[PDB]
Design a protein around this nucleic acid. Structure first.
Ligand SMILES: [Mg+2]
Ligand SMILES: [Mg+2]
Ligand SMILES: [Mg+2]
Ligand SMILES: [Mg+2]
Ligand SMILES: [Mg+2]
Lengths: 74, 104, 136, 177, 53
RNA sequence: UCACAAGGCUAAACCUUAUGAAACUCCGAAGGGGCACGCGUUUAGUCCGGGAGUGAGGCU
RNA sequence: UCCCAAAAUGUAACGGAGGCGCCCAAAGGUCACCUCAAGACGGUUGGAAAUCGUCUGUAGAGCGCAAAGGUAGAAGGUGGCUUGACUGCGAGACUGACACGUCGAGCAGGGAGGAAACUCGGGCUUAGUGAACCGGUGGUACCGUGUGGAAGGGCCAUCG
RNA sequence: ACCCCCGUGCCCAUAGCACUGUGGAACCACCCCACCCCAUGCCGAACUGGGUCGUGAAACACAGCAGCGCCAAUGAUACUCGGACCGCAGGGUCCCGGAAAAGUCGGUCAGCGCGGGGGU
């Protein structure tokens, strides 16, 4: 009644076809909404983040297994 | 039940390792022990006991490891890692290990 | 008429009919020409009327069920909360929605029972026969 | 421990009349399962050792205690606490206990015209209604505590109950007559 | 964080020749006798800490 | 998942037929957001530092 | 924590519902293995539910708690060893007016489990909390009013 | 080169299940025995260890098969960005693009690699 006014935040912090950097956060999530690909590490709270620097692109597989990955730039 | 293989396989990191995947198939007294790359659908070396180890049965373990090790160094290898299926450790598969590892 | 289990509250909103045929379950139906709420009564009213027309009818089919808890100002003001858990339960109707349908009775019996059912309704209505079969 | 009458006679029995595909097609015995009903209404943490004693003495094999299913229904129940005992019998030991019963414990029983012939496991397995624990050669009232009873399930590879009955019968299973 | 009449406790640490605190939530409830673990002081580490105060 | 209309079946279940949903979702737009490019016309932007006011809004 | 929240984020109400002020020396680390709820046939204490067996069985179960997400290749269910519920650090980011808050590769000292690649700076995550001040205690040896000490203070823990 | 088998990937249901016909000494599987390595909170069922005969039964492999799943058009619609209006209100229409869900027409019982073993 109503007694939670805090937003957390979530969403997706770095989208697809986006230049990223190493240590950036590509996503904030509750469970694993999508899992990590190559280039990607994952913290305690899930939260896919970047190992390397590059172009972050998305792979959406078969409805409910999804993946964020980092392809090279150079 | 068949999740043992899927577990042990998904455990081993394909890409982020950089290394290579040495499989083993222990089924009949015939075995495989083929060594696969991670990424490219291809396979690097792959020795086997598949034909004529000449009376050796599970003792051929060392041999089929030994062979592979040699056959490995041919293309060259940097510390490939061990992908088994269900089959865990000790006598049978540990000999293929102690052979192909330390034999190169 | 009344629901036995729920979440207990609601909003409100409207758009064109979805969940009713032109016809099913009998020969002649009754269709709403206007969007509105129908109370637990007005059906009870219409059920008891159509029934009080032909006894051993025997087909009275009410395809509308109210589950819409609505509330009311108990006595007064705004200092307080949302209120009135049990005031009345409506259903929501919208044109093309077929509220009632009957059969086993005459053509004229349907005409007149639907006419008596017409009043006691917050909405305009009308009656038809069957062209259409979508699924069965 | 037989296995000779197991092979031969049981197999061609159905091969010489209605025919059959192969020697491996013919039904075989997978395991014998002994489940000791305990706990709930009758539960003793002291008599656990009793039932385990008898059980371990009869089958030449150590018994294993079950648990609760993580349920509380109405009456006595909880997440876990021993509700009963289990012993699985396979191979030589299965046949030990089996000949033990059939050759001795089966004929010796109260008012015994047989055990129920009707379909037990539609898929071709078999169950038993064993009541008294004292009807065995391996358990008598010479040395005892109280009176209880055990349950036994027979698993076979039989495809139907018709292939069950005739199978288990030649092994010395009598039927209600 | 907060404290009062209650069970458990927070003790911290102490040990041979190192002088140091791990500062760890313990408990007196289910199992408490030794609060004992292995930890790293100003030494090479490699040393056992007895967390009973 | 909760609600629910008729019939069958021997009251859950189960099938035929038929619906409701802010806290249901097998599905799912129009639109919205981020990035890049300008492939196109435009003009504002950011940073440092001085001075503010404002922190009662109103209607459609 | 859901809904309201108009498919980014955010968003009010004396709006609609429900939790928290903990717990776990193992519910942590790692390694190794295990797979659920339910239904139908048959069984001794049973005869709605126990326990056993056969059969079906992407979850209809479980996850210490509220709920949402997430989970079956486990995050679930057992054991082996254990104490990374570490010390000195923090590339780079999410988030916030600030103050806080969160995620974190990689580096060293040193350990843990594994044969191994490796994982480990508490717990599937998201609540279990409280700036500053003034004090309690253990370490340190920086200041110390002429000087050498000591009192008092500082700095690292840390308790109220 | 072609048949086929064992391992292993990409694809992760238009590749899944059911019904099922073929396959046995090449490969696979049961079955085989196990004091001992190793293990079973009880049983070598599972791990695991020693090897054939035996059958291809069961499992796995291949093939027929579209009863079930799964994918699924065109047309038309629901809704809607923008533009312009009606009705006191609930609510509604017109122009203009975008445009589903479901259902029907259908579509399938996969496809693309790598290494090795054994046939013609
Ligand atoms: Mg305002
Ligand atoms: Mg939002
Ligand atoms: Mg929005
Ligand atoms: Mg003050
Ligand atoms: Mg408009």
């Amino acid at each position: 009644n109503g007694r939670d006014s805090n937003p957390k935040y979530l969403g997706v912090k770095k989208f697809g076809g986006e230049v990223v950097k190493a240590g950036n956060i590509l996503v904030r999530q509750r469970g694993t909404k999508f899992k990590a690909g190559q280039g990607v590490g994952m913290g305690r709270d899930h939260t896919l983040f970047a190992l390397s620097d590059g172009k972050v692109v998305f792979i959406n597989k078969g409805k409910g297994a999804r993946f964020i990955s980092i392809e090279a730039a150079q | 039940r068949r999740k043992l293989r899927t577990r042990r396989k998904v455990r081993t990191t394909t890409a982020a390792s950089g290394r290579l995947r040495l499989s083993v198939y222990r089924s009949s007294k015939h075995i495989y022990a083929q060594i696969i790359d991670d990424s490219r659908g291809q396979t690097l070396a792959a020795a086997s006991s598949a034909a004529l180890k000449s009376g050796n049965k599970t003792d051929t373990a060392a041999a089929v490891g030994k062979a592979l090790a040699a056959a490995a160094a041919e293309k060259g290898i940097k510390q490939v890692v061990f992908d088994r299926g269900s089959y865990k450790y000790h006598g049978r598969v540990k000999a293929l290990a102690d052979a192909a590892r330390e034999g190169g | 008429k009344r629901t036995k289990f729920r979440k207990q509250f609601r909003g409100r909103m409207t758009g064109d009919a979805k969940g009713g045929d032109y016809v099913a379950f009998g020969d002649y139906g009754l269709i709403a020409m206007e969007p509105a709420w129908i109370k637990s009564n007005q059906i009870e009213a219409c059920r008891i009327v159509m029934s009080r027309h032909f006894r051993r009818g025997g087909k009275i089919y009410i395809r509308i069920f109210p589950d819409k808890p609505v509330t009311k100002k108990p006595a007064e003001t705004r200092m307080g909360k949302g209120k009135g858990a049990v005031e009345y339960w409506v259903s929501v109707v919208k044109p093309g929605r077929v509220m009632f349908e009957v059969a086993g009775v005459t053509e004229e019996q349907a005409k007149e029972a639907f006419r008596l059912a017409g009043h006691k309704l917050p909405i305009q209505t009308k009656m038809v026969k069957r062209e259409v079969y979508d699924e069965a | 421990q037989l296995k000779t009458k197991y092979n031969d006679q049981v197999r061609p029995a159905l091969m010489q009349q209605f025919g059959y595909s192969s020697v491996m097609a013919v039904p075989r015995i997978e395991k014998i399962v002994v489940n000791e009903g305990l706990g709930s209404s009758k539960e003793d943490s002291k008599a656990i050792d009793k039932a385990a004693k008898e059980l371990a003495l009869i089958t030449l094999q150590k018994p294993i205690i079950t648990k609760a299913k993580k349920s509380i229904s109405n009456f006595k129940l909880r997440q876990g606490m021993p509700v009963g005992i289990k012993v699985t019998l396979r191979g030589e030991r299965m046949y030990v206990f089996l000949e033990k019963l059939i050759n001795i414990g089966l004929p010796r029983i109260r008012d015994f015209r047989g055990i129920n012939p009707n379909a037990f496991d539609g898929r071709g397995n078999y169950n038993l209604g064993i009541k008294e624990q004292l009807i065995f050669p391996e358990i008598t009232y010479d040395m005892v505590d109280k009176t209880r009873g055990m349950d036994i399930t027979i698993v076979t590879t039989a495809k139907t109950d018709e292939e069950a009955r005739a199978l288990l019968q030649s092994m010395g299973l009598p039927f209600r007559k | 964080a907060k404290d009062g009449p209650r069970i458990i406790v927070k003790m911290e640490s102490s040990a041979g020749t190192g002088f140091y605190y791990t500062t760890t939530k313990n408990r007196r409830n289910t199992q408490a006798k030794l609060e004992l673990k292995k930890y790293d002081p100003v030494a090479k580490k490699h040393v056992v800490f007895r967390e009973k105060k």
